[PDB]
């Protein structure tokens, strides 16, 4: 037989039942994958250097604390 195909009648009610959740903050899930490759490569080099500097800084902090 012939019946009703489309309606949006109750749909915004359903969508608002558990609300329209807001977006994730920009500081979360900010993956750089797929962005402009040269800048990505340079930033990776800087990040490797920064990890090494953090390791040295913690080692120096341990030594200076042990000095006291």
């Amino acid at each position: 037989a012939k019946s009703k195909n489309h309606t949006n009648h109750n749909q915004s009610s359903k969508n608002h039942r558990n609300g329209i959740k807001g977006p994730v903050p920009l500081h979360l899930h900010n993956s750089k994958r797929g962005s402009w490759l040269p800048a990505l490569v340079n930033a990776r080099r800087v990040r490797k250097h920064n990890q090494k500097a953090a390791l040295k800084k913690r080692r120096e902090r341990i030594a200076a604390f042990a000095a006291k």
């Binding site: 977006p23 994730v24 920009l26 962005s35 402009w36």
Partner: protein, 157 residues
């Protein structure tokens, strides 16, 4: 049935009257950085890197810059959540957004006030509420009334 990529864009993707033409040199010279707020507005005279019609008139943050293109993160509700859609456009379809102009002005004014108070200078006088009462001394006082001529006049013929 027809749902094309550019379906229903007759008036959306059209130049305003006597404002046709290729984008301008200021658009070429504007510098776009990652983290800038931009308005996504489609330029109908380019037809390269043009955003889908949904993103016309949305504002988002730049996540990526390529030599001729801009990646913008745009909020898009779908069912019960809003996604963060990363669209790719040419730079001609973004404008430096003014959505934070008032907030930047407020922060600047607060820094300026802090500097002045540190220096001991004269703070600007405070604005006053217009809603407080007071004496009114009228210049002209007229009778507000309906007259015959109003009903006579607002009838045509």
């Amino acid at each position: 049935h027809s749902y094309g990529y550019k379906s229903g864009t007759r008036h959306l993707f059209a130049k305003k009257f006597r404002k046709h033409g290729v984008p301008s040199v200021s658009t070429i010279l504007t510098n776009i950085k990652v983290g800038d707020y931009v308005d996504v507005v489609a330029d109908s005279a380019v037809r390269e890197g043009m955003p889908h019609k949904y993103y016309h008139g949305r504002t988002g943050i730049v996540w990526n810059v390529t030599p001729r293109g801009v990646g913008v993160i745009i909020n898009k509700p779908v069912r019960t959540r809003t996604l963060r859609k990363r669209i790719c456009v040419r730079f001609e379809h973004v404008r430096k957004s003014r959505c934070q102009e008032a907030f930047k002005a407020k922060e600047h004014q607060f820094q300026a006030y802090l500097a002045a108070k540190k220096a001991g200078k004269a703070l600007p006088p405070l604005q006053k509420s217009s809603r407080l009462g007071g004496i009114v001394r009228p210049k002209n006082v007229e009778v507000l009334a309906r007259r015959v001529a109003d009903y006579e006049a607002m009838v045509p013929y």
